[PDB]
Paper text:
Peptidyl arginine deiminase 6 (PADI6 or PAD6) is a poorly understood member of the PADI family that is crucial for early embryo development in mice and humans. Canonical members of the PADI family catalyse the post-translational conversion of peptidyl arginine residues to citrulline in a process known as citrullination. However, PADI6 does not yet have a confirmed catalytic function, with its classification as an arginine deiminase based on sequence conservation and genomic co-localisation with the other PADI family members. The molecular mechanisms surrounding the function of PADI6 are poorly understood, however a growing body of evidence supports a structural role for PADI6 in early embryo development.
To investigate how the lack of conservation in the PADI6 sequence impacts its structure, and to gain insight into the molecular function of PADI6, we determined the crystal structure of hPADI6 at a resolution of 2.44 Å. Like hPADI2 and hPADI4, hPADI6 crystallised as a head-to-tail homodimer. hPADI6 possessed a similar domain architecture to hPADI2 and hPADI4, with two N-terminal IgG sub-domains from residues 1–121 and 122–303 respectively, and a C-terminal α/β-propeller domain from residues 304–694. As for hPADI2 and hPADI4, the hPADI6 dimer is formed through contacts between the C-terminal α/β-propeller domain of one monomer and the N-terminal IgG subdomain 1 of the second. Ca1 is coordinated in hPADI4 by two glutamic acid residues initially, followed by a glutamine residue upon Ca2 binding (E353, E411, Q349). These Ca1 binding glutamic acid residues are not conserved in hPADI6 where they are replaced by a alanine and methionine (A362, M420), rendering Ca1 binding highly unlikely. Only the asparagine is not conserved in hPADI6 where it is replaced by an alanine (A382). The aspartic acids (D359, D482) and histidine (H480) are conserved in hPADI6, and structurally align with the equivalent residues in the Ca2+-bound forms of hPADI2 and hPADI4. The catalytic cysteine of hPADIs 1 to 4 is not conserved in hPADI6 but is replaced by an alanine flanked by two cysteine residues. C675 is still far from the active site centre however and would need to move approximately 9.1 Å to be in a similar position to the catalytic cysteine of Ca2+-bound holo-hPADI4. By contrast, hPADI6 is well ordered in this region and a loop (E670–D673, blocking loop) blocks the entrance to the active site cleft, occupying the site bound by BAEE in substrate-bound hPADI4.
Author numbering:
A (entry chain A): 7 to 63, 71 to 165, 177 to 382, 390 to 694
B (entry chain B): 8 to 63, 72 to 165, 179 to 694
Amino acid sequence: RAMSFQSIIHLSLDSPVHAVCVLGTEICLDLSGCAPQKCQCFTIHGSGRVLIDVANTATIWWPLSDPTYATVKMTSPSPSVDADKVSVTYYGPNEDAPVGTAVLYLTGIEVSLEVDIYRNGQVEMSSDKQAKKKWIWGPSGWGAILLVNCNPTKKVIFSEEITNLSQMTLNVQGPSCILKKYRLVLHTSKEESKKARVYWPQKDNSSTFELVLGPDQHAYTLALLGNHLKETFYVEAIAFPSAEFSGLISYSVSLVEESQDPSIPETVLYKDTVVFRVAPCVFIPCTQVPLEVYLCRELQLQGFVDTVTKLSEKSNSQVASVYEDPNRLGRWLQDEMAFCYTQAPHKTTSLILDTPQAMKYSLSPGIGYMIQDTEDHKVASMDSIGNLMVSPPVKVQGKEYPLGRVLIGSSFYPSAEGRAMSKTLRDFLYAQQVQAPVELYSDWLMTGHVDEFMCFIPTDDKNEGKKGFLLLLASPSACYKLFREKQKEGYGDALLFDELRADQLLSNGREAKTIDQLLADESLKKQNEYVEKCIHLNRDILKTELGLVEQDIIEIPQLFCLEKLTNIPSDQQPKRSFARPYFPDLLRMIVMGKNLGIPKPFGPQIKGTCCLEEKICCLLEPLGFKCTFINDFDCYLTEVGDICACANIRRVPFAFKWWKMVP
Amino acid sequence: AMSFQSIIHLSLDSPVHAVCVLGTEICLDLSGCAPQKCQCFTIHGSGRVLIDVANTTIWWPLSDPTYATVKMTSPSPSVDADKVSVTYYGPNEDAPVGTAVLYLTGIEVSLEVDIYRNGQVEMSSDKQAKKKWIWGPSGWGAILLVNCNPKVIFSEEITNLSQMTLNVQGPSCILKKYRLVLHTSKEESKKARVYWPQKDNSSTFELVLGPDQHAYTLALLGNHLKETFYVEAIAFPSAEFSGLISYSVSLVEESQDPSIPETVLYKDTVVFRVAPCVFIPCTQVPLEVYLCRELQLQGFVDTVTKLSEKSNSQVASVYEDPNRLGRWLQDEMAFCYTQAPHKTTSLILDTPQAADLDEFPMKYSLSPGIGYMIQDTEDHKVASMDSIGNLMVSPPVKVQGKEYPLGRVLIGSSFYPSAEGRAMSKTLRDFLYAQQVQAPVELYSDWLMTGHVDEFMCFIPTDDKNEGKKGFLLLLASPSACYKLFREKQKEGYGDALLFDELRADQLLSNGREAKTIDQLLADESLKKQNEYVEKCIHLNRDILKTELGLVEQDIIEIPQLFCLEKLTNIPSDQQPKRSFARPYFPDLLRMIVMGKNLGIPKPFGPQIKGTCCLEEKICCLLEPLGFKCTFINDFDCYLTEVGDICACANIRRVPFAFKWWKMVP
């Protein structure tokens, strides 16, 4: 018989050995095992396609130690059986006549599954048949990547725009009479198979593809017929990383020899394996350049819609009209949806991650869609993708976060009526690994949204090598100080909510008051002292987990007031009070480069000018920002569940490749 | 009062009053209240204040963003007991233009554990590094042991749990205003238990945190508060549990005013890692040989016991389990260990295949101090491979640099999606991979009836570690080697030598074997075709083992061994697989009991030459020169029993690795 597909071949003097070898495999030859006793040296010959590596511990005679091992490899497929050969000639002590000779006849067979492991936009061969089985993060790492299909049976037509999925090439090569003996099996674990789909084009250039592997088929058989098989398969991921799926999927090809005796089972001779990582879902901070501006113009194409639309024009950003959904709560375009992206070397896909807390959504061409499951569905439930803010890229005590860090609001401690993100959604976020999430304390808010006490704005200081962002933070203490400063100047008669109409103040549950009155409202100060404490707790957290300094923080005067949650049934109405903005929150701004669309506060007016608007411009306009105040008081004070003119902005995906990070 | 503020804004008109939690940095904006004319300042503080003027009689220059962080070293004795004064100066004016004052009160609120793994709780200077668990010799992070013992009172012998100390200090007029809340996430709470010894009787303990309590309130009254808590894990790492559990103490001030809610001022968090379940290879020294003597002490148990005494190892009798299939002690249980700096716990991991209703009684009374832990499984058939008996630990190895100081778990499975393939269930496989410290290796054993790799491979401990070598040897079955040996014997004229010579008629007939001469064996075409198939399977594993354990041919020794292919008949015929599986033809020489250099090898009853087995002679020629002392076990019935039938089995408890698992980098 032939010593085929064996890691070690025992050489023989009487008769030669014949073996069939899969390309890339190392065969160890025990040269000293069959060496006569007299021998003390040998000479080794080989054909061209054979690579001989003698181990440690013109004719060239090498010493025959005990043991003496030499590993043989085959570089290219054999053109015919036994078309390569190795000969070991043993020599006795001082005779010059060869004592004996051992002969090996090799046939080289190629069976390789190859993918784009070097992330150069093409399927590249991997010489290291062991390294191709690993997926390593970092600039020195490697590993093919797989994109989740974000487009909303046994055969499917994929057009050329969608055929930008990952590529996996199966190459089989060798003498026909050898290849005919075996069959191939492309397979993966059943768990893995339920996490991606493999399609095979039925004919070259055919838009028609057959699902060879998928959730219902973890094994696909291929018949070898002596030709030099060359087939490209197309894989697509079906789900982002999750708590039970690290994102790694392996595919293998196994060589099988059907049995010639029914009693004897069939035999397995070789297996090659490749690895894909499912690219994670990456969220984009507001410091990134705006590209599109989606507005849920809820029959209110004026005020917010008109000014926001104008703002995007100033910032060179497109506007897309979103259609209101009757089955969804108000402000669903931002509280229940988020712009994100998932990247691979061959294609970048931007999409909406939707977290229905309650299906018709029409995006600009090329923008994907994906639904993430939620568990809590309250009106003020903090278990929505809206309870999330992405910090700009930062560097905390060495460790880099080039894609920023997701920030999620929860209850700092197990409060009696605390609220927080569900396990399902939090687990989804933590599994992406590339924007290490940070827990913030926003349970004191009624909405739970951190955009009501903080907001990031882009600076061009990175030209000088600076951080390139600023953190704006609500500070009731700064507003009280400003109002007290105006009082010292004699402007205590100035009135908050001055240029506002009674049908708006009364419907929005606010009443106008002078600087002297607010600075005398004792309950209002106790409430704003409570909020000031909450904000400083988040200030200490943010400075820690984002590596911020006080030079990065700009306090913005902002007042709040504590009110019960009344937009839900009384049976589930929390007894405690939650914070709501007293006047339109200045930190809920629309950031578009240096153009800032800030909500108009309607603060006390001095010489016909809002003192809050004047102070905000004094703070930011010297930094190069263009404040543009949006006059819609009804929209900015709308209830938690009521309908408002919503807005959500698509932004440029990070230029940094997420796979070059080291989580 | 700017109590617990990250930044304090100074003022020349009035001083600031603040409470500072020990270990926290308060940033001071000196330039904010600096008079415009000023170009320099002087900063003084009290002994307990640490002032770090950091930014990009002594006068320091006053830059535009002049910032300084103040820290407190020890708790304040009384409110405002410590002060910092910044005096600002104008240009060419000896008179100080102004002064700002801050009053600091230092409060300690620290939750501390043994993060440096020296068996004692240690204060953590870095309040943010203690939240991290870092692997490796330069890492840190406290460790937790699972409870493997088969209000609550716990004796001192069982009081070897992990310790978590809570310390609070500071003036009482301040502490009395707040309360503590020791808590953990709801999910984490369901992974461990925290007990607090009552101040009355130390032997009695109260469950402050557990699977039904993720928050526990303590009222802060006195100047000083110190309480020690004892933590135990309840389950090893799994697919739904990385092994990290954190506990935090939050400082809460109650709100007298009904309209305003309570306020959170500070939180200290510590992190524990649950120590994984580590399996031991047979190259480690034996301590106890457990034997399930199924009402038969003649061949197997009698020999094993004598080998155990010869090897300086105790012997422990195992009560036979009437509700479990035979060989359960070997096939359904494994001796593991979980290690912590304070304590190492050896235990038995049982994967009961015997059924979902395998019931109320677990008749295993191990030696004192030996734990017990059940791992659930999915497949419970007779020839199933979904059990901890389908597991072999490799010796410590190095593969392309990456080290495996605890060895590598090896699991049998179907290499490819066979038509009737078998493997470990997801549940068991996930449990094993979750341990991370013995990174599993998938091997091909679906071709054997039992699925056990012990029937084709065995590790034996060499003492060449004194010579800086690997310290083990890999014995591998070789049907080809056995044929070559038999052919040599035929060539010498011994073709008449008879396999199974010294065995009686009742033995062969009951164990389904027929004596044959060497001439007959070498003639049996089906036997050659059956062992050629087994040769192909083993050679595939040989490549896997060399790659994933960094082995060379010098590490491998071929042991002559023959097999045969048979249909699984020990089960109902309606569930009988169509295919054939390999079984040892004559007693498997590799299913040996390894105790140091004393090797208990099954007696093969091979062809005899001059009244001596040639298989025993070959085995001794191979291994005795390497220092091993072979001792053949004569029990033909035991080593040829069917899959489900009763056997005299053994399971040896061995020394846990010396290497501390937490010092490796998976």
